[PDB]
């Protein structure tokens, strides 16, 4: 019934608060100055970048791209911790869990990245940096076209004014996608996603009673996500070829290969 679906939205929301340190809540506080706490160090150019190293953790584009690698890796670890709390996920065939995560974590990275973005830039190092969108375009090809698709998604996506408790179910719906290439056993995956989709719809009716067909609007964006992902994998294919001083992190390499 409706009761069991609110319980599921609650379990998911709690796991999400526990698994993800910088939530959309904090991120909007920071981005609005409404935190009334220490503003982030703004990185708008080459000099601001190198002055910034104190609040952050050989070529600039190559250094930016490879620093995002450590962030991606800690994201994959947070998202993997999170998936394990999705009821019935860990009881799946371990080979299915790996496949769902492999195809899922980048779609969730771009989903949650949008929480940290406005039209002008994106929070970095857990909200204590803010790197400008223009500075990121300012990078040298093929690095100047890396974050611009994500800024483009984030501005349309942030329109739906979702909050952490909507995103917690939405994330879980993305992971439990029964149509991932290579799934040994689709049905029990689709059983869980059916429940999650029902929980998401309830949550969206309750938390946004004025907002209408937010549920429908949000399922079409799960498509926008897959293309920002395939576009992303190609741009890596290119720079893995054109730039071979660069090291791809082992974990990132496990994911993107056979994708």
């Amino acid at each position: 019934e409706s009761a069991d679906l609110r319980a599921l939205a609650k379990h998911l929301y709690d796991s999400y608060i526990k698994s993800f340190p910088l939530t959309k809540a904090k991120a909007r506080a920071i981005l609005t100055g409404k935190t009334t706490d220490k503003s982030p160090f703004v990185i708008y150019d080459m000099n601001s970048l190198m002055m910034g190293e104190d609040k952050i953790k050989k070529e600039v584009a190559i250094r930016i791209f490879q620093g995002c690698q450590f962030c991606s890796v800690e994201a994959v670890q947070e998202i993997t911790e999170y998936a394990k709390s999705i009821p019935g996920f860990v009881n799946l065939d371990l080979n299915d869990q790996v496949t769902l995560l492999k195809y899922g974590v980048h779609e969730i990275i771009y989903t949650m990245l949008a929480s940290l973005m406005n039209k002008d830039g994106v929070l970095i190092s857990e909200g204590q940096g803010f790197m400008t969108r223009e500075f990121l375009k300012s990078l040298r090809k093929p690095f100047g076209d890396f974050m611009e698709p994500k800024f483009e998604f984030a501005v349309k996506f942030n329109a739906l004014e979702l909050d952490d408790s909507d995103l917690a179910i939405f994330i879980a719906v993305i992971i439990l996608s029964g149509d991932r290439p290579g799934l040994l056993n689709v049905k029990p995956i689709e059983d869980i996603q059916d429940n999650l989709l029902q929980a998401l719809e309830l949550q969206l009716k309750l938390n946004h009673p004025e907002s209408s067909q937010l549920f429908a609007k949000l399922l079409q964006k799960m498509t926008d996500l897959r293309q920002i992902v395939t576009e992303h994998v190609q741009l890596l294919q290119v720079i893995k070829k054109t730039e071979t001083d660069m090291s791809l992190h082992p974990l990132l390499q496990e994911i993107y290969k056979d994708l």
């Binding site: 869990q97 995560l101 974990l251 994911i255």
Partner: peptide, 11 residues
């Protein structure tokens, strides 16, 4: 095959 993922999962 996916030894870091297998390991993050089964951790």
């Amino acid at each position: 095959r996916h030894k870091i993922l297998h390991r993050l999962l089964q951790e």
